[PDB]
Design a protein around this ligand. Sequence first.
Ligand SMILES: OC[C@H]1O[C@@H](O[C@H]2[C@H](O)[C@@H](O)[C@H](O)O[C@@H]2CO)[C@H](O)[C@@H](O)[C@@H]1O
Length: 257
Amino acid sequence: MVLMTKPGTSDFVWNGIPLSMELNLWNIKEYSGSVAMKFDGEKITFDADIQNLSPKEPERGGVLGYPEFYYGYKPWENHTAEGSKLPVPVSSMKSFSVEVSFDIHHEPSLPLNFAMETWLTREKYQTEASIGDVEIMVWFYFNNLTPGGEKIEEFTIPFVLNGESVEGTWELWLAEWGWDYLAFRLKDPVKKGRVKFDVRHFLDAAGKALSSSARVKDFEDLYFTVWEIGTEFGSPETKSAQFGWKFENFSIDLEVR
Ligand SMILES: OC[C@H]1O[C@@H](O[C@H]2[C@H](O)[C@@H](O)[C@H](O)O[C@@H]2CO)[C@H](O)[C@@H](O)[C@@H]1O
């Protein structure tokens, strides 16, 4: 049982899997209202009803926070729950399946998404990402929110949605900021459902997308550090946010060559 009502990180174990939950409001200068994130052994829930919001780093634009949970090592926080099998070199990953059920609710106009991501780093345990590293996101849902940078292509990547084998069409957005940002955004966003997919398909498309970059070199030698699952929300214009979610039936399976 884990309960947090302010920003912070806590570890937990879900069906034997060591994980970390972060009530991540990294780009929020200050807020009024309440946030509550909880793990009860069977589900992780998050609820927010906050106001008086403004960006911590205004000039970078983009979102305000990212309440999430993750498996592995999150560089920015020098943190991992114990017993984690990540990070591992991208070249060593044969497959990395992620499965989770989700139910996201939100006031109608809120910029928000259901996004999962990883950070690929040159060194195994960096404490930040910079030039030469990569941030790769996978968005299964979005509302009044587009990824950063611009769309550079589309990839058809399969996955199991609510128990059925489907093919998703994913727009790939790339931005060269302090690191390389890549976001795969599903054309038919899903607000509630269950998905199972292999992160390897996204790592394969990302590596190809960057095969001529002068910034990202030797993609396959980078370390796949973590797998975060959460909901980014907000924009420089967002003054308040009312939303919440429930994640259940979580599991991952890393298979290394
Ligand atoms: O900038 C450090 C900050 O990054 C947070 O991840 C951001 C990422 O920087 C941004 O490019 C993307 O649009 O959104 C993600 C998630 O909101 C990270 O979660 C923080 O821990 C870190 O302090």
